[PDB]
Design an enzyme around this catalytic site. Structure first.
Site, PDB file in Angstrom:
ATOM      1  N   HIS A 327       0.841  -1.193   0.000  1.00  0.00           N
ATOM      2  CA  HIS A 327       0.000   0.000   0.000  1.00  0.00           C
ATOM      3  C   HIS A 327       0.878   1.245   0.000  1.00  0.00           C
ATOM      4  CE1 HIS A 327      -3.561  -2.239   0.094  1.00  0.00           C
ATOM      5  NE2 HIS A 327      -3.717  -2.386   1.398  1.00  0.00           N
ATOM      6  N   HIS A 356       1.745  12.114  -5.713  1.00  0.00           N
ATOM      7  CA  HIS A 356       0.831  12.242  -4.582  1.00  0.00           C
ATOM      8  C   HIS A 356       1.550  11.982  -3.263  1.00  0.00           C
ATOM      9  CE1 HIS A 356      -3.285  11.812  -2.691  1.00  0.00           C
ATOM     10  NE2 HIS A 356      -2.512  11.239  -1.786  1.00  0.00           N
ATOM     11  N   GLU A 357       2.313  10.889  -3.190  1.00  0.00           N
ATOM     12  CA  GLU A 357       2.968  10.529  -1.937  1.00  0.00           C
ATOM     13  C   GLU A 357       4.102  11.492  -1.603  1.00  0.00           C
ATOM     14  OE1 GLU A 357       1.796   8.392   0.145  1.00  0.00           O
ATOM     15  OE2 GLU A 357       0.185   7.831  -1.236  1.00  0.00           O
ATOM     16  N   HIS A 360       2.858  14.403   0.207  1.00  0.00           N
ATOM     17  CA  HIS A 360       2.791  14.196   1.651  1.00  0.00           C
ATOM     18  C   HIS A 360       4.143  14.449   2.303  1.00  0.00           C
ATOM     19  CE1 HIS A 360      -1.283  12.781   1.503  1.00  0.00           C
ATOM     20  NE2 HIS A 360      -0.984  11.759   0.721  1.00  0.00           N
ATOM     21  N   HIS A 487     -14.907   2.288   6.875  1.00  0.00           N
ATOM     22  CA  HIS A 487     -14.751   3.418   7.787  1.00  0.00           C
ATOM     23  C   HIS A 487     -15.753   3.363   8.934  1.00  0.00           C
ATOM     24  CE1 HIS A 487     -12.825   4.486   4.037  1.00  0.00           C
ATOM     25  NE2 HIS A 487     -12.200   5.489   4.626  1.00  0.00           N
TER      26      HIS A 487
HETATM   27 ZN   LIG Z   1      -2.584  10.175   0.252  1.00  0.00          ZN
END
Ligand SMILES: [Zn+2]
Ligand SMILES: *[C@@H]1O[C@H](CO)[C@@H](O[C@@H]2O[C@H](CO)[C@@H](O)[C@H](O)[C@H]2NC(C)=O)[C@H](O)[C@H]1NC(C)=O
Ligand SMILES: *[C@@H]1O[C@H](CO)[C@@H](O)[C@H](O)[C@H]1NC(C)=O
Ligand SMILES: *[C@@H]1O[C@H](CO)[C@@H](O)[C@H](O)[C@H]1NC(C)=O
Ligand SMILES: *[C@@H]1O[C@H](CO)[C@@H](O)[C@H](O)[C@H]1NC(C)=O
Ligand SMILES: *[C@@H]1O[C@H](CO)[C@@H](O)[C@H](O)[C@H]1NC(C)=O
Ligand SMILES: *[C@@H]1O[C@H](CO)[C@@H](O)[C@H](O)[C@H]1NC(C)=O
Lengths: 596, 195
Positions: A327, A356-357, A360, A487
């Protein structure tokens, strides 16, 4: 020494001690996630247990400094966060009951099995068994079987557990001086003591509903167009004025309409932009993908990756023996240690995921100078909003042509723009009514406005009214269909995906403005714009030190969540959708159901 | 031709903690300062008052070599007129400091996977350090008003904290070995010239 001075000294000792113990837990967790061994699970649990025990003891110590005697807001921000909910405000017995309930619900979800009739041995898990059916199958009965069996065998188990889960969660929240558990969740957006930037917990409900009203015209035309295309595919299963059946939406719950693209593509003869072949033709590897992503952030003025990032990260699948959790995650271990875990393949999707990562990571590095308790996004929706906008710029044809992956002879016509925007709306716009409706149901359940004997009756009334989605099989109160989502059953707040969606397009519009972009917002690329990077960095370095309203104002110039940039992004599709639905009924009736 | 024992200080197997910084007095010898400055092995080599460029043409009465280990981001605190946990509580340089500060990365020596807890620093103190003062006390710091009775407790912390150097740390958190050279000039024999 005053109380505030003793709190400053107490936080001084906490920061150093927390950083050391957090690094030990993160390092142990990293070793397991990249190298799955029985040993590594124990070391991960041992280090994690020390970290949790340390937080519990420090939270109790932090409680002995009452917030009423602190004037420094930054000190009070760290102290209240440490005081958290306390060290189990409830009794020990009730805290143990709640813990077991949470674990049982998680185990039921992750181990729930559904077996095909006439073969009790050929059974499917949700992942990958049932998810594969809901995402690829075009058969009405097969999708219905997976949809119903998941809720009738796994959801029914979760119904008694979730009922007691609500009671215990409310008891903890009310003893924390909150109205209910839903009000406790909304506290992530609460701001106090800052003139001109305050935000109440109840204001979140007001702003979410007010912004959702402006989303309705866009979603209604998207709903009408999707219904018309699906009605051509399943002509005996879909009424032209009714809600969409719940099992024909692309996944187990209809959270995203992404997998409906094949049946709803506007122009099925113009193919998608897929630079995967070009990457393979040029012998790209994982390091090249992350090197290009690093190139992108440097172009806007952000710092390059640290030297430990390249040595310590795992940018490829380790191999055939050593197993790892693939992941994609960005790791902020502290002590200047930043890594990315990703089993990168040479594809366009992984090329965008790296951007995207790494987004972060850039957020994590920016607020590394902040105190330990303030090293996070401004609110729960800031971090993923920052990550999403990086893939927006990197996926544009303008950016892909500049890095040599898209040929300069390739030119985009307005049909490909409609195809791209429609695909974006199926994922981005489609989830907004789903996200808002799901959290509204949980808010009302926690608030006590929905009685137990009307949980499922109210759940599908709101699905028909707000989402325009109708259940294919009637469900009594033995069902717990909301708990069939990860969730809900794993105790995670869901409104973060609604606020983050509006945040990212606010961020992108402001950054593209600073980049002097000309044309539609969806074609923008913030590359080579140090003005855009500086504007973003002014918010990234803040972390949690400032109210999220002020942090948002640093980027976009507005103090509150706004939906106009989202509609600006999808305006070319909205104009096209309204013209398409001139011969179709727009809106839905809530009384039609596929089971008559 | 007595050569000053600089190898004892720079090439020591283990350095001192910054709170217990070592001092080595250098006397009656010949020091080749140009070797150190023109070696290209140190990340930091800054001299105050004196000039590192070929100023081994000068005589001093006594030369003091102070050595310790700090993290990379705290190297900037080893300088006149600086503030921080190291400057106020561990090692303080005077405003009129005359000498050189030498530092280099020691991640290959002072780091260990799992954590190297040999090097410590002082986190709390009643007051700031006077220049060139050393405090190795282990008295429990009293943050509140209740006596601590010599053990840790609420508002009673052990004053010394550990770096816990790990090789995977960032550069700002990696260990750095620091050598501080003090050049004293008294109305004295001036026994350290070192052509
Ligand atoms: Zn993310
Ligand atoms: C809140 O406290 C922090 C630290 O206790 C204050 O920030 C310090 O400000 C002084 C100068 O006045 C600096 O020398 C310190 O280095 C700062 N420390 C930190 C950790 O930032 C801050 O000014 C206080 N805020 C208010 C409004 O009083
Ligand atoms: C994986 O972990 C084991 C211990 O569980 C260790 O002996 C081995 O060296 C590790 N392998 C890698 C590639 O890190
Ligand atoms: C990052 O950029 C700096 C220049 O600001 C350079 O000194 C350093 O070597 C670079 N590191 C990497 C890993 O590219
Ligand atoms: C950014 O500028 C550089 C140098 O002018 C150029 O090579 C590159 O193609 C530009 N990138 C974009 C996305 O315009
Ligand atoms: C694309 O542009 C052409 C030229 O004006 C127009 O005729 C066509 O309808 C457009 N396609 C759309 C808006 O989907
Ligand atoms: C430390 O050892 C190296 C290699 O033996 C040598 O070049 C250097 O001069 C030594 N340090 C001092 C201060 O002499």
């Amino acid at each position: 020494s005053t109380i505030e001075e003793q709190a400053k000294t107490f936080l001084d000792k906490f920061n150093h001690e927390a950083e050391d113990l957090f690094y030990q837990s993160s390092l142990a967790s990293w070793n397991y996630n990249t190298n799955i061994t029985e040993e590594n699970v124990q070391n991960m649990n041992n280090a994690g247990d020390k970290w949790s025990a340390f937080l519990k003891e420090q939270s109790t110590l932090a409680q002995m400094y009452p917030l009423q005697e602190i004037q420094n807001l930054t000190v009070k921000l760290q102290l209240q966060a440490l005081q958290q909910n306390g060290s189990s405000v409830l009794s020990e017995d009730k805290s143990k009951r709640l813990n077991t309930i949470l674990n049982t619900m998680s185990t039921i979800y992750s181990t729930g099995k559904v077996c095909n009739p006439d073969n009790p041995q050929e059974c499917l898990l949700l992942e990958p068994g049932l998810n594969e059916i809901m995402a690829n199958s075009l058969d009405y009965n097969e999708r219905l079987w997976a949809w119903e069996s998941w809720r009738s065998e796994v959801g029914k188990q979760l119904r008694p557990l979730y009922e007691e889960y609500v009671v215990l969660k409310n008891e903890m929240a009310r003893a924390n001086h909150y109205e209910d558990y839903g009000d406790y969740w909304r506290g992530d957006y609460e701001v106090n003591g800052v003139d001109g930037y305050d935000y109440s917990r109840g204001q979140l409900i007001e702003d979410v509903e007010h912004t959702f009203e402006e989303i309705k015209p866009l979603y209604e035309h998207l709903h009408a167009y999707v219904r018309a295309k699906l009605m051509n595919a399943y002509p005996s299963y879909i009424s032209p004025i009714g809600c969409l059946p719940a099992h024909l939406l692309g996944d187990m719950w209809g959270r995203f309409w992404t997998n409906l693209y094949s049946l709803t593509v506007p122009f099925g003869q113009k193919p998608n932009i897929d630079v995967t072949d070009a990457m393979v033709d040029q012998a790209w590897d994982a390091q090249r993908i992350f090197k290009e992503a690093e190139k992108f952030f440097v172009s806007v003025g952000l710092p390059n990756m640290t030297q430990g990032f390249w040595e310590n990260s795992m940018l490829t699948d380790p191999g055939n023996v050593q197993k790892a959790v693939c992941h994609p995650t960005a790791w902020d271990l502290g002590k200047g240690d930043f890594r990315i875990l990703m089993c990168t393949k040479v594809t366009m999707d992984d090329f965008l995921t790296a951007h995207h990562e790494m987004g972060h990571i850039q957020y994590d590095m920016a607020y590394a100078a902040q105190p330990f308790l303030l090293r996070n996004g401004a609110n729960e929706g800031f971090h993923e909003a920052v990550g999403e906008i990086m893939s927006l710029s990197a996926a544009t044809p303008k950016h892909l042509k500049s890095i040599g992956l898209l040929s300069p002879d390739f030119q985009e016509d307005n049909e490909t723009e409609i195809n791209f925007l429609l695909k974006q709306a199926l994922t981005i716009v489609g989830t907004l009514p789903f996200t808002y409706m799901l959290e509204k149901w949980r808010w009302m359940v926690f608030k006590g406005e929905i009685p137990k004997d009307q949980w499922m009756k109210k759940w599908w009334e709101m699905k028909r009214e707000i989402v325009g989605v109708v259940e294919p099989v009637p469900h009594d109160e033995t069902y717990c269909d909301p708990a069939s989502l990860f969730h809900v059953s794993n105790d995670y707040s869901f409104i973060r995906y609604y606020t983050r969606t509006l945040y990212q397009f606010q961020f992108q519009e402001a950054l593209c403005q600073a980049a002097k972009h000309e044309g539609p917002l969806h074609k923008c690329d913030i590359s080579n714009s140090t003005e855009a990077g500086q504007k973003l960095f002014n918010m990234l370095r803040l972390g949690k030190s400032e109210p999220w309203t002020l942090a948002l104002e640093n980027v976009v110039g507005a103090k509150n969540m706004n939906v106009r940039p989202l509609l600006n992004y999808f305006e070319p599709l909205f104009t096209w959708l309204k013209d398409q639905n001139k011969n179709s009924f727009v809106g839905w009736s809530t009384d039609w159901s596929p089971y008559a | 031709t007595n050569l000053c024992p600089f190898g004892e200080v720079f090439n020591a197997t283990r350095f001192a903690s910054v709170y217990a910084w070592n001092r080595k007095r250098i006397s009656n010898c010949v020091a080749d300062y140009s070797v150190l400055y023109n070696s290209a092995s140190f990340s930091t080599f800054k001299c105050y008052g004196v000039s590192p460029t070929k100023l081994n043409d000068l005589c001093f009465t006594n030369v003091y070599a102070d050595s310790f280990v700090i993290r990379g981001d705290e190297v900037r605190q080893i300088a006149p007129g600086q503030t921080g946990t190291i400057a106020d509580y561990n090692y303080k340089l005077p405003d009129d400091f005359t000498g050189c500060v030498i530092a280099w990365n020691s991640n290959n020596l002072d780091s260990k996977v799992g954590g190297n807890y040999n090097y410590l620093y002082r986190l709390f103190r009643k007051s700031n350090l006077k220049p060139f003062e050393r405090d190795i006390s282990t008295e429990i710091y009293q943050a509140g008003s209740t006596p601590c009775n010599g053990v840790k407790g609420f508002n009673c912390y052990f004053p010394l904290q550990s770096y816990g150097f790990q090789p995977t740390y960032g550069v700002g958190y990696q260990p750095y070995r620091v050598v501080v050279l003090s050049f004293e000039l008294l109305h004295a024999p001036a026994t350290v010239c070192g052509p």
